[PDB]
Paper text:
They are also critical components of the DNA-packaging complex and are involved in tail assembly. Here we report a number of crystal and high-resolution cryo-electron microscopy (cryo-EM) structures of the T7 bacteriophage portal ([name]). The structures show two conformations—open and closed—of the portal and suggest a possible mechanism of the channel valve that regulates DNA passage.
This complex shows a tubular conical shape 293 Å long and 175 Å wide, organized in two 12-fold rings ([name] and [name]) and a 6-fold nozzle ([name]). The channel valve of the portal was found in its open conformation, which should allow the free passage of DNA into the ejection channel. As the monomers are inclined in different directions in [name] and [name], a single [name] monomer interacts with four [name] monomers, as also described for bacteriophage P2212. The [name] nozzle protein forms a hexamer attached to the bottom of the adaptor protein. In the mature virus, the [name] nozzle protein is the main molecule responsible for closing and securing the DNA inside the tail. This task is mediated by four closing gates with negatively charged residues found along the [name]-internal channel.
Author numbering:
A (entry chain A), F (entry chain L): 294 to 342
B (entry chain e), I (entry chain d): 2 to 50
C (entry chain O), G (entry chain M): 7 to 196
D (entry chain d): 547 to 735, 745 to 794
E (entry chain N), H (entry chain X): 6 to 196
The structure:
């Protein structure tokens, strides 16, 4: 329950432009640059449950 | 594809042979020149009165 | 034309790719390298303002014909002209504008056009100045100093400059899908 | 400097030279011996540009101070001009005396430090050996009979070296467009003549670097070869 | 034409350190033929890398005032990219002066509020952008005067490393959180 | 039931920046760098059960 | 500057890749190889402390302006400075730190900054000493002694050194996800 | 400057055995130009391979004591990396002395408990690490003085083999079990 | 790309020809030297008084 947006420094998209844009505002960037940090315990979660 | 030459010794002298005949360094007309061996190609000595 | 303090820096940066700086370019029959790069520079200017950008397309502009001649004059300054809404009815013919639907030439009143006017190397943003300098450097590379590796790096670096300048245009003039256009402005009226 | 050479002849391998100062007129002997010793004594054939074998007289040593007073118009014929004077002893003792500001006519003395009652003292000038290598560039042999050197392109040097054989200490000065470098080279760490390869860096365009070798310090010098190591990218081709 | 700076000399000296020997105290167009040329390349990359827009260079709410008698406000080459504050930026240079392409006029009564980007020196920048500006100018100097494949490939890889670090500096300078910082999904999370 | 976050040293992302960021804070990094240590006994777990 | 007992070993290990050991480096107009490698060493130092590590980032530091001039001084020692929480408002302008929201330069009281201060080749962990030596050796390889295979092995070995030094940073100052940060500390309070 | 060790001479003799001839009793900086040079490369790798942190080298609960009159405790180049005992290690060197970046002070009243790594010789190491230190210094000597592709490729493969063996030594020295030896899931399995 | 030469016989002597004219080994000024064949380039014999 902690959203961290990881922006890929090697790319183009940058968060002075995602955030300031109103809704439905075009802005420049590629989608493979921003991702979000998941917590990949799945097999541990199923065995614990 | 990007050829370079270096005509390195302009001792030369005029030669009224055609273009695809000549040596390097020669020239097609040379007036008031002086082609020494070590120093290249000088203005001629200045005719003291 | 006239010397421009930024334009001589541009023609110098064209020759920064190959060789030595010239000075001031103000002679017709002159240094062939300077006038040659200056022709390449103005051609890339005329092409780079051709594509249509949001600071260039002067939207609702009105042209007026001559009072005696009754004829509004197309120019080489008028880079590309289109009509306002759709199915643009204006074309150049002789050096004069012309209707391909009214089948006529003489205009009584004015005319409303989306036109592009040719601007200098000045009066452009620095993004576009760097893009004209790098694309004209690629052209000047390919046409006179034919070396392969500098062409590869100028191709990569033109791509980076166009990347930056599309970032400028999608940042100059924020375009929003659902609150700014002509179709889905009304669909979201409650 | 300021020394006129007014004759030169050579019996079999000895070049007898008279040479004129601005005060006197000398006579000399340039011997082309290889490892032999010029004067009786002299542990390493000191390169000295004038070379006496002097015995220090009785009264020169002041008991109060530490030095002896050797008088150069007496150890030679008469006065000198200007130059650097080296005093050598039968040990490895080498004392270098700089010139006075007026120069060896206002101060004709030579202040050798120690007690010198009588002991063989070899006094001379110093050679000014200077040699530049060339402007370093590509020199490839053009098929048995001509040396055509390669001009097209930029050759960025990295290093160079001087092959020396049984030699002393020397100083490879390297000049640039607007820079200077010294690059000394000590002994083999007494005399300690070495037989190795001193490797000094020269960095630049090779059209503007100019390396030149000095040596003053009384020891022999045998530069038997050199060589460099550059970069040389060429934005053209041949044909 | 400019006066020297204590760090700009080390910058141009690190440009010539790609291929060449270190100069000192440039001060002329004839001190070295390669030094002043690399200084021109360094000032060009200085003008370019601040055109991309960064969160410390975009001076957000700036206000320009026109001349009192001339009734006219001066665009400059020192001005680097100027946009409007909210959206559909209406300001563009013509002649040497800023101009409204919607009002269709160049006579301003009061001031003008602009997201401007100004040109700064090689100094007054963070060390991240100094290192990246030296590496990109070094690649440009290499490709234009001693074009060699090995040094070009390694300066390309090392430019990508510098841009990676400087995007890290931008994403660290001015933390941009999605849900409590922007304009749209700040109001959606008001309870 | 022991979460260990393995950060890949070969990558870019680093945990002085995941942790200090508040929720929904952009921060720099790639998602393939952080993973989490699972315990991959699955066939042993099914045969034991 | 001054001779340092470990920095001479660093300049020697730069030249361990190519050639011979110099001695003591204490002259401006000197051995060009030693001073040139020393410049590469200090550049890789100033870059390797730029990336931000959790021993260099002095967190809550307070800077004070001059009492007469009323003007707190940015320095080249102040490597990269940011504010404490978020949306940092301090930037260098003239050589002096400057608010870009308060639009002012003169400060009455002090200022709270996360700052990086430039340190020497000493005052660093041995991990980072080995990493500055190997990366500056790669730079010194690529710019003067252009041999390909030593460039390949120094690239591989730079990657291994950075691997070790990231291991040092994630072992210096254990960062746990759920009991040490600011957001999900409060979510696990029972 | 150091004095010889009977095993260190065999180590340096195994460095020169990659390319070159065997020396005996080094004793000088002018005995061989390659012997002292490889000895310097060997001491550099001796410093480096203990930086990585091993289970026999991280001396866990060590206690440094400051000087009595100086009221100050001395960081050394002999100290290789020092960290705090539990977490968020607050110790770093400034000037030559250890220093708190949280307490913001350089004056210690009592002692200080540190996970320190001290520098050791080529001797006082296990034979696994001696062999890996000789093979890595052999690769470093090869790539800097007789760079040839065949001997480089085989020393790279054989360095990876030595690192394989020495990680086997580290996972064997100091047995680490997941569920009965650590800090978190020792308590979870208390019945 | 990393060129090396070895000017091996500095017998030479000065030559005031230009740079792209010379042989190897020559030099641009040589004072008090002595260029023997086998032994390379010595300081001259020292002028016994």
């Amino acid at each position: 329950s902690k959203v961290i947006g990881l922006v890929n420094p090697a790319g183009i998209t940058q968060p002075r432009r995602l955030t300031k844009a109103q809704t439905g505002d075009f802005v420049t960037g590629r989608p493979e640059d921003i991702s979000f940090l998941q917590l990949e315990k799945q097999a541990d979660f199923t065995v614990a449950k | 594809a990007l050829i370079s030459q270096s005509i390195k010794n302009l001792k030369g002298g005029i030669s009224q042979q055609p273009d695809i005949l000549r040596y390097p360094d020669q020239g097609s007309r040379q007036v008031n020149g002086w082609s020494s061996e070590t120093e290249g190609l000088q203005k001629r000595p200045p005719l003291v009165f | 034309n006239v010397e421009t303090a930024a334009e001589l820096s541009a023609v110098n940066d064209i020759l920064a790719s190959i060789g030595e700086p010239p000075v001031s370019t103000l002679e017709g029959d002159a240094n062939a390298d300077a006038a040659n790069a200056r022709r390449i520079l103005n051609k890339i200017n005329r092409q780079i303002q051709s594509r249509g950008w949001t600071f260039n397309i002067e939207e609702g502009i009105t042209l007026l014909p001559d009072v005696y001649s009754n004829l509004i004059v197309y120019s080489d300054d008028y880079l590309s002209l289109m009509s306002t809404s759709g199915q643009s009815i204006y074309v150049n013919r002789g050096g004069y504008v012309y209707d391909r639907t009214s089948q006529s030439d003489r205009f009584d009143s004015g005319i409303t056009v989306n036109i592009i006017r040719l601007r200098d190397y000045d009066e452009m943003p620095e993004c576009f100045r760097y893009w004209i300098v790098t694309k004209a450097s690629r052209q000047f590379n390919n046409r006179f100093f034919g070396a392969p590796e500098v062409e590869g790096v100028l191709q990569e670096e033109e791509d980076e400059a166009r990347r930056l300048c599309m970032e400028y245009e999608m940042d100059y003039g924020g375009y929003n899908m659902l609150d700014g256009d002509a179709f889905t402005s009304g669909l979201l009226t409650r | 400097e300021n020394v006129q050479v007014l004759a030169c002849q050579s019996i079999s391998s000895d070049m007898y030279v008279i040479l004129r100062n601005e005060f006197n007129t000398f006579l000399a002997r340039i011997s082309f011996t290889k490892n032999a010793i010029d004067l009786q004594g002299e542990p390493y054939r000191a390169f000295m540009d004038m070379k006496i074998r002097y015995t220090i007289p009785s009264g020169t040593y002041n008991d109060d101070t530490f030095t002896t007073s050797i008088h150069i118009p007496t150890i030679y014929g008469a006065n000198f001009g200007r130059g650097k004077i080296t005093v050598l002893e039968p040990d490895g003792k080498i004392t270098v005396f700089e010139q006075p500001t007026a120069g060896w006519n206002s101060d004709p003395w030579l202040r050798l430090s120690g007690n010198l009652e009588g002991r063989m003292v070899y006094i001379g000038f110093n050679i000014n050996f200077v040699y530049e290598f060339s402007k370093f560039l590509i020199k490839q042999t053009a098929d048995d009979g001509s040396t055509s050197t390669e001009d097209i392109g930029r050759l960025q040097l990295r290093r160079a070296w001087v092959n020396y054989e049984n030699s002393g200490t020397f100083d490879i000065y390297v000049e640039n467009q607007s820079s200077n470098w010294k690059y000394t080279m000590a002994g083999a760490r007494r005399l300690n003549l070495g037989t190795g390869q001193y490797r000094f860096p020269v960095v630049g365009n090779a059209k503007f670097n100019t390396v030149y070798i000095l040596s003053d310090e009384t020891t022999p010098l045998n530069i038997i070869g050199c060589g460099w190591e550059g970069n040389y990218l060429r934005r053209s081709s041949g044909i």
